[PDB]
Design an enzyme around this catalytic site. Structure first.
Site, short mmCIF file in Angstrom:
data_model
loop_
_atom_site.label_atom_id
_atom_site.label_comp_id
_atom_site.label_asym_id
_atom_site.label_seq_id
_atom_site.Cartn_x
_atom_site.Cartn_y
_atom_site.Cartn_z
N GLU A 220 3.46 8.67 -5.29
CA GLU A 220 3.80 9.47 -4.15
C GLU A 220 5.15 10.16 -4.30
OE1 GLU A 220 1.39 10.22 -2.37
OE2 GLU A 220 0.16 8.56 -1.78
N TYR B 202 -3.00 9.02 -9.97
CA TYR B 202 -3.46 7.68 -9.51
C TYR B 202 -3.11 6.56 -10.47
CZ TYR B 202 -5.81 8.88 -5.16
OH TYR B 202 -6.07 9.36 -3.87
N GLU C 279 11.20 -4.63 -7.05
CA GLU C 279 11.47 -5.74 -7.98
C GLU C 279 10.54 -6.91 -7.68
OE1 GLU C 279 15.54 -7.56 -7.89
OE2 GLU C 279 15.16 -7.77 -5.79
N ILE D 209 6.98 6.07 -19.94
CA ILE D 209 8.23 6.30 -19.22
C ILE D 209 8.71 4.96 -18.65
CG2 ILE D 209 9.39 7.65 -17.43
CD1 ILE D 209 6.17 9.09 -17.84
N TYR E 40 -5.77 3.32 -0.80
CA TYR E 40 -4.96 2.61 0.18
C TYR E 40 -5.83 1.82 1.15
CZ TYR E 40 -0.69 5.44 -1.07
OH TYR E 40 0.37 6.08 -1.73
N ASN F 145 20.79 0.38 -0.27
CA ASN F 145 20.17 -0.92 -0.52
C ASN F 145 19.44 -1.45 0.69
OD1 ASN F 145 19.43 -3.09 -2.15
ND2 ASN F 145 21.25 -4.30 -1.64
N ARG F 146 18.68 -0.60 1.36
CA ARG F 146 17.82 -1.06 2.41
C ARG F 146 16.36 -1.12 1.98
NH1 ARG F 146 20.95 3.16 6.64
NH2 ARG F 146 19.67 4.73 5.59
N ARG G 248 4.52 13.05 -6.50
CA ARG G 248 3.80 14.10 -5.77
C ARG G 248 4.66 14.88 -4.83
NH1 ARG G 248 -0.44 9.62 -4.68
NH2 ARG G 248 -1.77 9.83 -6.57
N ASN H 6 14.23 -0.85 -3.44
CA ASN H 6 14.38 -1.46 -4.75
C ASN H 6 14.01 -2.95 -4.68
OD1 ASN H 6 15.17 -0.74 -7.63
ND2 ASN H 6 16.89 -2.12 -7.31
N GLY H 7 14.26 -3.57 -3.52
CA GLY H 7 13.94 -5.00 -3.30
C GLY H 7 12.43 -5.22 -3.34
N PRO H 8 11.73 -4.47 -2.52
CA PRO H 8 10.27 -4.58 -2.62
C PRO H 8 9.72 -4.30 -4.03
CG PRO H 8 10.87 -3.62 -0.55
CD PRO H 8 12.14 -3.67 -1.35
N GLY I 218 20.19 -2.88 -11.49
CA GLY I 218 21.27 -1.88 -11.54
C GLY I 218 20.84 -0.46 -11.13
N1 LIG Z 1 -4.35 3.32 -7.05
C1 LIG Z 1 -3.93 4.39 -6.35
N2 LIG Z 1 -4.40 4.53 -5.10
C2 LIG Z 1 -4.08 5.58 -4.32
N3 LIG Z 1 -4.57 5.75 -3.07
C3 LIG Z 1 -4.17 6.85 -2.35
C4 LIG Z 1 -4.81 7.10 -1.05
O1 LIG Z 1 -5.61 6.26 -0.66
N4 LIG Z 1 -4.67 8.26 -0.40
C5 LIG Z 1 -5.23 8.45 0.97
C6 LIG Z 1 -6.40 9.44 0.97
C7 LIG Z 1 -6.59 10.50 1.89
C8 LIG Z 1 -7.78 11.15 1.54
C9 LIG Z 1 -8.34 10.51 0.43
O2 LIG Z 1 -7.49 9.45 0.09
C10 LIG Z 1 -3.28 7.78 -2.88
N5 LIG Z 1 -2.76 7.59 -4.10
C11 LIG Z 1 -3.13 6.55 -4.85
C12 LIG Z 1 -2.64 6.34 -6.23
O3 LIG Z 1 -1.84 7.11 -6.74
N6 LIG Z 1 -3.06 5.25 -6.94
#
Ligand SMILES: Nc1nc2nc(C(=O)NCc3ccco3)cnc2c(=O)[nH]1
Length: 258
Positions: free
Chosen positions: A174, A77, A142, A6, A120, A192-193, A177, A138-140, A12
């Protein structure tokens, strides 16, 4: 023929081009034929053939750089990516996963596994910043595409690479999801913020597995115990039933049916 691809570009980009993209991502993550209480479930990882395990997301920007993320359909993920002639993967959690990723990006000249994992927590540490302090839009996005592209050449320090992952993950996985998070990105694009996600976004992200469980264990949508989320202003509120979440959550990770 190889994994479904995808495409999105930041050049743009509009709320419609971004919505089209996230909609197509969802369509490749799941067939949609397992649904509970109106919410689609991703394919169960147990017994999924390798040849259906992954999807590819090709990201381009106005500088005409391009990178390709690989997403695991079982949980959306981001597991790694390719830029030109190299591909890099987060350190896998288990040997089964380690094994699966051998099937991605097989024709690339250079392949590596990072010593760090892709959650994370680890990425924040690496970036030395929290998602609440990292701007989205979009800035971050790119900027994150260039940072990722430049990583092989040695052009990009690790903290920046980690920030760029955190951006991509939120704007792609996310958003897939959660319709709520897709809308949050649409707003940044529309005006554009660029801005950090607020507590409502962060707590939904953090609660995705928990929501998937609550809805899937629910008694006809009524949760067996309440789930606490956060409003935009950081105040805590309680959700008791799937009904409220129908316009908020779009996809759940598979749990067995009670
Ligand atoms: N690489 C990646 N890392 C990710 N990390 C998180 C993430 O930490 N979630 C927080 C969490 C809460 C409980 C277990 O974990 C979510 N999506 C992703 C994801 O979609 N890709």
């Amino acid at each position: 023929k190889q994994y479904p691809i995808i495409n999105f570009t930041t050049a743009g980009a509009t709320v419609q081009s971004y919505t089209n993209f996230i909609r197509a991502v969802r369509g490749r993550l799941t067939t949609g034929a397992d649904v509970r209480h109106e919410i689609p479930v991703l394919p169960n990882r147990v017994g999924l053939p390798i040849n259906q395990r992954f999807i590819l997301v090709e990201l381009s920007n106005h500088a005409e750089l391009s990178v390709t993320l690989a997403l695991d359909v079982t949980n959306a993920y981001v597991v790694g990516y390719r830029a030109g002639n190299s591909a890099y993967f987060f350190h896998p959690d288990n040997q089964e996963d380690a094994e699966a990723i051998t099937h991605l990006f097989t024709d690339v000249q250079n392949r590596y596994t990072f010593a760090f994992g892709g959650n994370y927590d680890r990425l924040e540490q690496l970036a030395g910043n929290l998602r609440e302090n990292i701007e989205l839009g979009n800035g971050p996005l790119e900027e994150a595409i260039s940072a990722l592209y430049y990583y092989s050449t040695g052009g990009t320090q690790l903290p920046t690479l980690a920030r760029s992952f955190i951006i991509c993950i939120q704007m792609i996985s996310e958003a897939a999801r959660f319709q709520y998070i897709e809308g949050e990105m649409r707003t940044r694009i529309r005006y554009n913020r660029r801005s950090a996600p607020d507590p409502s976004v962060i707590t939904l992200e953090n609660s995705w597995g928990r929501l998937s469980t609550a809805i899937q264990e629910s008694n006809q949508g009524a949760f067996a115990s309440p789930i606490q989320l956060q409003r935009r202003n950081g105040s805590k509120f309680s959700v008791y039933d799937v009904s409220i979440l129908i316009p908020i959550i779009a996809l759940m990770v598979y749990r067995c049916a009670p």
